[model samples]
Target: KSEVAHRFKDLGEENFKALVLIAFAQYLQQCPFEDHVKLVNEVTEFAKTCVADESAENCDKSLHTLFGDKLCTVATLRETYGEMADCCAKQEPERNECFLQHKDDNPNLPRLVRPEVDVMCTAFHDNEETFLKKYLYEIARRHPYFYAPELLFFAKRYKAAFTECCQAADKAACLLPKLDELRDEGKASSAKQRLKCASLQKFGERAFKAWAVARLSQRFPKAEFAEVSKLVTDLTKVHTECCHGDLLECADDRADLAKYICENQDSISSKLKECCEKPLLEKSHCIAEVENDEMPADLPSLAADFVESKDVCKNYAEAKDVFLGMFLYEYARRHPDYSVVLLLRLAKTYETTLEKCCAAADPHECYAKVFDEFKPLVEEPQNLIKQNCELFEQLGEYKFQNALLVRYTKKVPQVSTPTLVEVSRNLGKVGSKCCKHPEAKRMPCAEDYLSVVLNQLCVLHEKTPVSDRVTKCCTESLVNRRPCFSALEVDETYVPKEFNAETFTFHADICTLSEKERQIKKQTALVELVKHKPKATKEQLKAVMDDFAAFVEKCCKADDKETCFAEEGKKLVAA
Candidate 1:
């Protein structure tokens, strides 16, 4: 069943675990079972490793495969995967094709990035509460006949908890001590009331309460895990509602909560080693290694150059000892350079692994870095076609417009006619217009940009890439998008006979055609015009105008000689 449909069937004691279990099972399939075992082991061992080294290396290593490299959570991955998911979801309506224009563009645009320590906790807190609340709300919507009010109450309650978490994140430095003081202050406070209500709801309220306290003090991190497991098992046992028509709300321990459970991650990993057991999925790194271990069923003759290059390239670059170095080399070599497709892959990898490890306040900062680093590489890429080819031919259309205008009058008017052809050409000029617009001049216009750059450049002393370097003082900022002008008939308002002008109004529609699409169509037109740019004359412009006028006239009636502005009503009124 589909995600929404499966959720719609449940009507009784709302169980969210079944949905989680099913999704978990499906999710597990995407990876080899061994990977899941490894992750489980890592979580189990996190506490021991943290105690042993007090460093986050081991923890970061394990998560590099889990949340960083995989589709396990919607946290920062939302920035990378949302568009692709949208593409597939809207395939039936052909809406996906429209989004492809942005496929090569960065996915990190919408997100705000922060420090890893804060980013992970923020991700954990946001996703955990959101997933649970959404699961509950789905249940509420599906099973209105059951404890819908309770479900609604808890969802709202969880939402409040999540909100508190967000607010706490904002004032975390100051709020931690006060939250720590809460245990001594007793039950009168809003925090205590929220915790009490949530604990009874099977959504791991006890764990959250402990976590909330931990946020203020480091002592409370794992106290809530034991109670958390009970909540998960209780709902898992009541799986029938989810299996049948009624969809279950997992209040099953939110999966992200699993990351915090291990008192020692390395200890659990060591235990996993002892078990030699199959994991729920294969670790991504391990998958390639294991899959390649087997001999090929059929071998083909290889070129001598291929064999020689492989043998000779071994000593050229030394393998790195660190995960970051290993990931960077492996990803870079695995994909081609300078291609948007390859850059996106590398971008996602860095966004998750490197960005996630930096321990920022917002996890998404990683992707933003990834995007800023990768965008310029492809933005002004060399046109695949030659300067004389059809693609460039379109760009030449701009030259043609200029040449044609000289014979007619002087400079080319921004608007002579609004044909699909002209619209496309005009759109192509947006980039140049932006170069002159001076609106995007300030270095790192987004607040997050300045913060991210400042943190890395100052606190970490990590150098910003040459590509990302902006002018310290700019005379002007370049505003990239401009509202495109479109015209439509004014059907409601009547034009006075005395005025005697066209009955249409001009409107600026920002969304009518996206800035990108307009530019593309403009490029398309440009190519056509440029094909004859040097030779374009006043006669051609006049002919094109006449053709456009005829096209608009046909909209009212194919047989009618009068244009859309004609008063056909006069003939009907006289008759």
Candidate 2:
């Protein structure tokens, strides 16, 4: 039934039974005490079916019996446990801890929920105590592995909302708003939780562990990478068990993690030094908020290009996880500036490319231009940010900033005016700080600044659907974020039929205008020209601007300037 299930399927009868026993027993530790004995019986039945069948196929019924509504937890655990089953061979109390070794914090599973206010209100109003317990029961099953305290807090808030709403004349009215608040609160909470978890799930455990160590190595400059690796290795165990949903282990290990870090106080970053002193409950979370360190200077650059070898395919087949893991880690450590999402895409592209190459005859050739495959990920965003920032310098901040609002308004017409205004404002800030850097440093300057802008865009728009272009661009890592905007396609459907030619008309007022005023007038004219001709090429806009500027030079000096501008404006707009 599963990739990991196949491992259990081949195990000898006695071994399989021990494995089941250890699993159920460990699950029992995290489950309610009342169900402890029932769990034992369920474990017995589940193991019996598997052992008798040997094939282990018909045991699905017993699985649902043991896990019931928490099939989500078991679905993931069933496969993941195969690697950690050495714990199955261990003795008693220690065995449970062994099973806790691997944790898929963000299991990346499909979520489920029922949000009918009438249904919830009716169910709760009729059986206050019974339904309230059912509410928790449902949530507990729904999220078998969430922090127990968090679940309780949500449940308490839910109960309070119900109590307030059930007494109202129109139950749904009061209840609807109350329910929405809880839903929003829960949504925001998990969304933020997933933000950190995203990097973990994206690169898989090996790369995550690499990053975990990498972060430490930079923070503790005195420590060797090997030394940092050892610290993270032990810390990872504590994190694994806690992430696996064991409430007791979560607290104990979380506290121990803090204690461990504090004991090695001098080895941690000054940023992290205070976290070790935090009360245990808050420690791990505070530590988690500490961002990954910048790439150390000593970390070598990535290979100029991918090198395919005969050994890679064979090795990959055997250790698909770790091979890809190695790739992600290698790339990640080399590009510490990379955003979490971009790196994940990097990992995804590598894995997918290898899968294709390994199946084909020319693995080497497939990989020959391998770096070329990743170029778009880096290039597109690079182009967008590059173009925008250069224009920021070329146009100056005020003009370039307003131009963003104007151009983007045409490009992504569906986005709100307020959103475009803010987006422009954010980019302009990047220009203000980054544009003035010496030519030697401007790219990195813009890179460091623009990434924050893109991340904010990702956060705000994640829930609101926009263009697929914006959506994909927003998902990229901060390092490549500028290029991601390059990937976005301009909206093709827009065609401006309303032509306001006053800005284009020739006038003597232009001859007297200051350097900037004249530049602004001409740029504004070009912008309006492009607004109507979104399909026009960059060169085409240049053609029109070049043509118009020469026309202005001639017309502004003429005594009949109004007639000259009017006639030339007609000719230019016609072009």
Candidate 3:
């Protein structure tokens, strides 16, 4: 269940709640206001409950509450969510995932038809609150997993703009044209959140939670409970403000999130607090070095919950927060050494595994076996090693490490750009040493060497969030998961603000480094370049790397090394 699911479940009448509030809204559209008064009365009562369900007699009364006469339009609405509920009730292929993807003949895109503004003006004249509520449900039933607060903001703005037009000297001219601007703004403001909201809303939220965890983790660092706790608030806030279009506050929420974590230091251990006082470059040492918490083991486990039931989907969907809560509770209490990010990762991954298992033709069987299969993958991060090993073999040492850098930085964005550089180098060590070993030794060699790095992932999991595309793929049908990671890819359609390709530069200081130190510096540059310009092509990156190599070769030996390096650097960054 989404965080909002529990409070609003009865709001639906189960069927109606599970369904959209689509039909009744249509009847409102068709019913003419008695100069606004009558429309307000009926809509006011209608607004009280989403489905009018406390009394079964009541929800149906909404029809007479509005009009059986406008029943023609109401029927279309009925079938959408009210009737859509009828069909969701008909699911077990668990078409819950199926029909939702195909709504009103479009997949979660907006709907716009001529709105006879005069009819709207009368309904909205003095009924502004009801107007917004009506309009809110109108769109709510029509859209994706749009959160309530975002909708309130969006609903209010739409109502106000309509107010601007309706009360103007000339209604049509003012209203019709302004619709274009508001709609465009509405469209743009929502464009990014739509994908994200759907990630959480697609009924499989491991990805969504992972996204929040990944975003909060990698975008900024939070170590202490206070910072992590604030992030949980911000995670809720992220959906409320950012989801609705209050991006400035949303960014401040995320942008200052890490700052806040580091800013208030009293709760932090004395040594840990001092790290926060230092400059950015100096903090990772203390933060990463902070002693791991001793393991705890007093909580209950619900691994049986998934394995025991065929009714698993509805139970979890009905009380996901419980599942999510029990999960976070179960995981953190047990793995005291796990980072907040890692705990969230565990929760999200477990949620996804449940999701995949829940979707199968034999969902119970899917859950039962997938968990068994999951054991080997867990301690070893089997999927990652499989992905790592293949690339290690195909590309060999140097290219394999470079690929790992690009992949990890993009996939686990929570790790700082610098930490990822170190992480990648250390991982490359495993490949460099083991990739050339006798064929039989490769897997064990890679596995033993990876432990040092994977152990750090637990501490940094809060910061190294995986990609949404990858997380979503993890939710793909469990029976076919091999097909998923084999191909379930990063949703590259959404570009992150961190990626850069045009900022490469060279400095003369590298010209004087010891050979090993110089290569490390150069590799750091490569990691930085890839981290900055991840979307840049591999071939493009190679040319950029070649430019770095060429710069040291030509300029380190030149009489005026700074000028030569600077000249080449400018061209590299420019090109």
Candidate 4:
């Protein structure tokens, strides 16, 4: 035997039969005209001898027979591609005559009928194994005149097997086998006992347990039981009513049962309400326990899927703003160590939009959508830290802008709106400078530098009332930190003309902390907030720290470090 044939022999009989039929369909194109009929007959006769199992007749015959006709049409179209097109001449009479003479000379030209062409097109478009068999049966039924008798018979004989085969790993695969065993042992008579048995299966365990316990408690009220028996037979009936044939056929049976209970809830409640009025509690037990499952196992009020939690879907009118934020969030979360680099690249793309979009009527809506889009950037671990840290970035910018507004528009003898607008124009430039690295090092210190600068800016703003001009001019120097002292330094001058840090009471905290101990603490807090908090922003942390500062000043200045500061620290962390 040939090497290929020897390999086929090594495959068990059933596998060999399937692979050989697939091979024969492929080989049909290369077979000679004289051997075509012989090959077709040989394949079909071999198919008729093959069966799925010992008890069943030839299920293999049905699949192969239809495939044979499919192959013939495909092979002929492939072989005579250019010649067939050429056969249709320009003149109507000439076109018909040319095609008729071509077909008569080459008898294999008309391998596929019109119905076969349509059916194959449907199969090709759908491209699903289950739908292929379904279409085969349906097409044969609708166009009996076009299909052969064997093809029709084959569809009928194997349709059930096809359906059964399709559900190989269905939910009921977890249920039916256990149920059958129980029935064999005569232990499945009682509803409570049956449910307890079902709880062992992986498929519907939780829902079933919820239904059983809730139903029993609601009905019995005061009646306690060591081993509960009996059931609301009507509720049990719905299980059988929703599913088909065998238990194994009932795929997603629990989901269907849940749906039925939800739909008929009012009717079921009324029926049970009538029973509750009766002297016996038996009828009251029928209180449909499905709604217990309706309220998701986790409480919705605190649920992760809540909109405020950044776990739900959101829409943004400005698509790219959300897209940019989401991509950066996800990329940073996936590469936490490389976050500074990612933010720099992202700022290059979106620094302008971040400021503009975040100042909208509901900036949270924009960031929420951003959160949704980028949630799957790193799929394995749901890194809420990387995702939520971007929100802090948004808040930092917003608060800084708001602080500028306080410095310019809201404060006494306020700066003019026109000059404020000029400052706003420079805002994007300052932000871009802050995010982009100044030096080209092997491993850039951008993230560390940015983290400290952000902490200094965020914390100093919390401490000092620095002017809008100073904030702007100082911010312009943020690209190069340390040398700039996070914007508190300038070359060839004591400090830049616009940059002043001596105006506010907290000015000493900003300058004297050349060590940046407070800056480190602020950065650490922000990092922990991103790591631990789900949807918290910088403003929330800032406000809490404002209270935290007051608490420390009021309590800790009393000279009780452990007693006063420890409670305040706990409060700050909790906040």
TM-score of each: 0.19, 0.41, 0.30, 0.16
| Candidate 3 error regions (>4 Å) | 1-396, 412-415, 432-452, 455-509, 571-575
TM-score of the candidate numbered 2? 0.41
Candidate 2: how large is its RMSD? 17.8
Model 1, which residues run further than 4 Å from truth? 1-523, 532-534, 538-542, 556-575
Q: Give a tens-digit lDDT track for model 1, residues 1-575.
A: 12222232332123333232223222222333334434433433443444445444543333213222333332122255433344323432243223222211111122222344455455646657445533443332222222221333334444444455556636555444543343222211222222222233323433333222212111121223334334334433333222221223322222222322233333212222322333211221121112111122343322232122233123222431222322332332222222322333343444354435345554333333343554453433223211213333454545533433232211112222222233333333333322232322211122112222222122111122221112111111111101001112112222222221232222233126665454444333333342334244647755754553454344444353343324543432244
Q: Whole-model lDDT, candidate 2?
A: 0.55
> What RMSD value applies to candidate 1?
24.8
Ten-residue segment with the worst summed lDDT in candidate 3? 12-21
TM-score of 3: 0.30
In candidate 4, what are the lDDT values of residues 471-557, reduced to their tens digit? 453344332222233223212222212312122112224323433355343433333333333244557856755764566456635
Q: Which lDDT tens digits does candidate 3 get at residues 1-575?
A: 22122223333232222122333332233333232334334443443553434443334432222323222222234335433344333433333233333332122334556668788788878676566555545554444434333344455457667768877787888777766776555543343345454344543445455434433332223244345445556566655554432322343344344465565554433345566766532443245335433333343345665557556777778898655654454445444323333345456667787777666687766666645654544544344545666677787766666666776665645445556766676677676666576544455455434533543333233223445543444354322222343343343554455635444455556667776576566666776775556587888988878866876687778878768867776676566
lDDT of each model, Cα atoms only? 0.30, 0.55, 0.49, 0.34
Model 4 has an lDDT value of 0.34
